[PDB]
Write an enzyme that holds these catalytic residues in place. Structure first.
Site, PDB file in Angstrom:
ATOM      1  N   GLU A   1       7.902 -38.605  -5.286  1.00  0.00           N
ATOM      2  CA  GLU A   1       8.148 -37.203  -5.607  1.00  0.00           C
ATOM      3  C   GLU A   1       9.643 -36.966  -5.500  1.00  0.00           C
ATOM      4  OE1 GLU A   1       5.210 -34.465  -3.898  1.00  0.00           O
ATOM      5  OE2 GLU A   1       6.761 -32.915  -4.000  1.00  0.00           O
TER       6      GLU A   1
ATOM      7  N   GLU B   1       2.469 -36.382   1.695  1.00  0.00           N
ATOM      8  CA  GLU B   1       3.132 -35.725   2.820  1.00  0.00           C
ATOM      9  C   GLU B   1       2.116 -35.342   3.887  1.00  0.00           C
ATOM     10  OE1 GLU B   1       5.311 -32.518   1.043  1.00  0.00           O
ATOM     11  OE2 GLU B   1       6.802 -33.864   0.155  1.00  0.00           O
TER      12      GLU B   1
END
Ligand SMILES: [Ca+2]
Ligand SMILES: [Ca+2]
Length: 859
Positions: free
Chosen positions: A512, A426
């Site tokens: 994820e 991210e």
């Protein structure tokens, strides 16, 4: 006090007999410094975990401070090591380490999770006293989770001849393994040989491949290289080829390991012997059918895992790490993503040994800091290494990012469990400023990785793919163009399909997923997903963060799609810090202090105690076990009664049919509530899963991956009987999970059990003592919170107590802790002399429980 001589192993344990002190003012780098009053510790060590929680710290890092810590170790170097090379190796120091040796500053290392080393030869006092000094400066805030502080991983000492294989100096490739499997396998090796003497040397290499732990007579391949001259002070890259005769493949079910031994010869005499652990296997990622291992399709049933070990803090104890892997394996996990930083080598060792695939991630953020963490690695990512910094481990010609990346790859390039290098997570989340430079940064990292190790694909976890950011598209294309795999964070079924349609060349997986938030043993409500008044969360799988999904949803979307190679659920274990939905990126308490201080994401809590969803995953993933698990517990004060006195009862199972029975209190006659049968689905690639398709199925599709009944509350026993596909009854007691819940009495006694009744007497090994608060008949009281005191006697020490409860601020280093949802954990560590450990668990008004643990000396 400690001693280094010529009779020790080439690389030896250097953990013992360090002096430590926490201080932001002391200047203790000089050998003549008086540390006689300092605390003595054996590494690995975490000096954050022993300090008090403070409201002025940050919730995401568990409200715990860091600070400046000093490590000092005095030791003699024997005369007979003069003319030999000596180096100290750190597997991890968090963070901003500075190393002095005998008063001379060797260099620094910023990143807290990558391994590094320093040569000690030039400043060693041979035949005398020596002093190594490590300054550690963990300035908060530097982390979105609890980092810990200090030398939290093993430290070793490497002593070699002047002519020697370089640090992490052997690279092994088997480029034709896929088509050579079963016959002769070509091994292409590259070995870095350093000549650190004053004379030229003509060296040959003798390299041998043989089963790990076996003898060289069982070798399956050997080569001796032609003599190569290496001038004084120079190094050479020596290539060689070994033909390995039908090596046994490394796989999840059979993780066969080999030792690849390199001997450096000069004048017929072996000067240096360097071993590297290896396994033969190949992988593949197909854009349509997903992942394969050794030519066989395998679904990546993975979890994300942070590094800390619960009540032990960040300390990378090998047994603690191994216990985590063992619990995950029983859930059916076959893969771990090391979020979001290099693993401890001990974890790589365990996964090599136990057959668990590792997606090893190197970085969280890149050049831009996250969540106001002005001291995180983004401050160092793009900086250069000072010219007087002698730190070693990776390439030093560009930035710290390249150093820490190549240092991690160098350590683990031969580990068969590592299947992918993940380069970030991210990267554009929680930052400030423009993101237009991130494609070029990503392409840079991809280029470094491809040059460092061509044998594995690289990847990352990007949560902006589902937002269809231009940058995410450009980066995924560059990953794909370099043989990489694209990881998407927190996509749902629709977004998975959109990726497949929009970017058909990408091979993807859920890097994820889920991020469901649950406490252990909470049933008085079925709702969650947000802050509560009791600082806990329901154990029903109806609770997740706004950008996440419940476990059944995130798995249903993955198991249906063969092009989604797998999932990495956030998370396998709870970890310290990030106590979402009580998370805080700045300072200050979140809610009423004491605030939740560890996570709720874990399928298993910090103490290793599984939550209810553990058995849902086990029913989906573990093909070597049968699961039959019922929630909730059946006490009136803990159930969630909807009007009509109906309690939602959930069954997690892999069976084909389940019959639910109720036995009224003191009846011994069970009455059938009803039965439900799963439907078997088969995907195009051959994967199978089960969904309930009865007339009373849930309107939400993914919730039909398990079974739900509405049962009116009444004291007694809710039991379940499982039947397989041929309608043969699955024998009672042979299934994992609670096949029956019974109304309990009040707490009457404690039930202590050591997971291992005999451990190694090396001052490292651990025994985990699980304690239950049960009634007179042995039924665990579901809501018991009795304070349990542990008395530890013998050749052992109490090193941690835990209950997994996020808002519990009681010291992990105390000898007592309240139970939570009926359970509490004690962790005992052996000493270095064999004997017996006696542990007694006691509490007011309850019958005590005692366990005995033997400790055996190292052979
Ligand atoms: Ca912060
Ligand atoms: Ca099963």
């Amino acid at each position: 006090s400690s001693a280094v001589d010529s009779k020790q192993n080439r690389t030896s344990d250097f953990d013992a007999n360090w002096k430590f002190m926490l201080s932001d003012s002391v200047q203790a780098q000089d050998p003549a410094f008086d540390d006689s009053a300092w605390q003595q510790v054996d590494l690995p060590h975490d000096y954050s975990i022993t300090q008090k929680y403070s409201q002025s710290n940050e919730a995401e890092s568990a409200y715990l401070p860091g600070g400046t810590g000093w490590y000092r170790k005095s030791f003699t170097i024997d005369r007979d090591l003069a003319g030999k090379r000596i180096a100290i190796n750190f597997d991890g120091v968090y963070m901003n380490a500075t190393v002095w040796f005998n008063g001379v500053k060797l260099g620094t290392h910023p990143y807290g999770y990558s391994p590094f080393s320093f040569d000690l030869t030039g400043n060693a006092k041979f035949g005398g006293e020596n002093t190594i000094v490590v300054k550690v400066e963990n300035r908060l805030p530097s982390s979105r989770w609890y980092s810990g502080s200090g030398i939290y991983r093993d430290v070793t000492l490497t002593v070699t001849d002047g002519v020697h294989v370089g640090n992490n100096g052997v690279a092994i490739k088997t480029p034709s393994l896929a088509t050579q499997n079963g016959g002769d396998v070509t091994m292409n090796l590259t070995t870095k040989v350093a000549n650190d003497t004053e004379a030229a040397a003509n060296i040959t290499l003798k390299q041998t491949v043989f089963p790990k732990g076996g003898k060289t007579d069982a070798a399956i391949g050997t080569v001796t290289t032609a003599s190569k001259s290496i001038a004084a002070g120079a190094s050479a890259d020596v290539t060689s080829t070994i033909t390995a005769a039908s090596p046994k493949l490394w796989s999840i079910k059979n993780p066969n390991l080999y030792t690849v031994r390199t001997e450096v010869l000069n004048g017929g005499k072996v000067l240096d012997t360097y071993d590297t652990e290896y396994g033969f296997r190949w992988t593949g990622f197909d854009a349509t059918s997903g992942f394969s291992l050794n030519g066989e399709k395998v679904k990546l049933k993975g979890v994300s895992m942070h590094h800390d070990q619960g009540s032990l803090g960040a300390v990378a104890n090998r047994r603690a790490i191994e216990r985590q892997v063992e619990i995950l394996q029983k859930m059916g996990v076959n893969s771990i993503r090391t979020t979001h930083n290099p693993a401890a080598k001990a974890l790589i060792d365990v996964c090599n040994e136990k057959g668990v695939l590792v997606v090893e991630e190197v970085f969280d953020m890149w050049n831009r800091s996250k969540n106001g963490n002005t001291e995180d690695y983004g401050k160092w990512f793009g900086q250069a290494i000072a010219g007087d910094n002698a730190v070693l481990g990776g390439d030093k010609d560009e930035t710290w990012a390249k150093f820490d990346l190549t240092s991690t790859i160098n350590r683990d390039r031969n580990a068969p469990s590592v299947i992918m290098w993940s380069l970030g997570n991210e990267m554009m989340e929680g930052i400030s400023g423009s993101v237009s430079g991130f494609p070029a940064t990503s392409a840079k990292l991809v280029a470094w990785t491809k040059a460092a190790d061509s044998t594995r694909p690289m990847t990352y976890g990007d949560n902006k793919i589902k937002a269809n950011w231009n940058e995410s598209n450009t980066m995924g294309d560059n990953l794909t163009a370099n043989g990489g795999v694209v990881g998407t964070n927190y996509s749902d079924g629709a977004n998975y399909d959109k990726i497949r349609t929009t970017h058909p060349s990408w091979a993807i997986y859920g890097s994820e997923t889920a991020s469901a938030i649950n406490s252990r043993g909470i049933y008085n409500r079925t709702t969650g997903g947000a802050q509560s008044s009791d600082k806990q969360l329901t154990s029903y799988d109806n609770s997740a963060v706004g950008w996440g999904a419940v476990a059944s949803s995130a798995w249903y979307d993955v198991v249906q799609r063969d092009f989604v190679a797998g999932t990495y659920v956030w998370t396998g274990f709870d970890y310290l810090g990030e106590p979402t939905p009580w998370n805080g990126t700045g300072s200050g308490a979140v809610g009423s202090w004491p605030s939740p201080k560890n996570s709720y994401f874990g399928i298993v809590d910090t103490a290793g105690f599984p939550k209810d969803t553990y058995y849902f995953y086990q029913s989906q993933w573990n093909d070597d076990v049968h699961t039959l698990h019922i929630l909730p517990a059946w006490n009136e004060n803990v159930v969630a009664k909807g009007s009509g006195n109906n309690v939602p009862v959930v069954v997690y199972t892999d069976a084909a049919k389940v019959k639910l029975y109720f036995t009224p209190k003191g009846s011994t006659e069970k009455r059938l509530i009803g039965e439900k049968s799963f439907t078997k689905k088969t995907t195009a690639a051959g994967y199978t899963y089960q969904v309930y398709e009865g007339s009373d199925k849930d309107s939400t599709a993914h919730k039909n991956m398990y079974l739900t009944w509405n049962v009116p509350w009444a004291e007694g026993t809710i039991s379940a009987e499982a039947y397989d596909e041929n309608n043969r009854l699955i024998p009672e007691g042979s299934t994992e999970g609670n096949a029956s819940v019974t109304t309990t009495g009040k707490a009457a006694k404690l039930k202590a059990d050591a997971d291992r009744k005999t451990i190694t007497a090396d001052g490292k090994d651990l025994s985990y003592i699980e304690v239950d608060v049960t009634d007179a008949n042995g039924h665990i009281v579901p809501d018991a919170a009795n304070r349990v005191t542990f008395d530890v006697k013998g050749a052992g020490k109490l090193v941690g107590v835990d209950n997994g409860s996020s808002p519990d601020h009681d010291s992990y280093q105390a000898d007592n802790r309240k139970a939570f949802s009926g359970k509490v954990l004690a962790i005992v560590q052996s000493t270095k002399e064999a004997g017996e450990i006696t542990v007694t668990a006691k509490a007011d008004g309850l019958q005590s429980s005692t366990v005995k643990i033997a400790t055996t000396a190292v052979p």
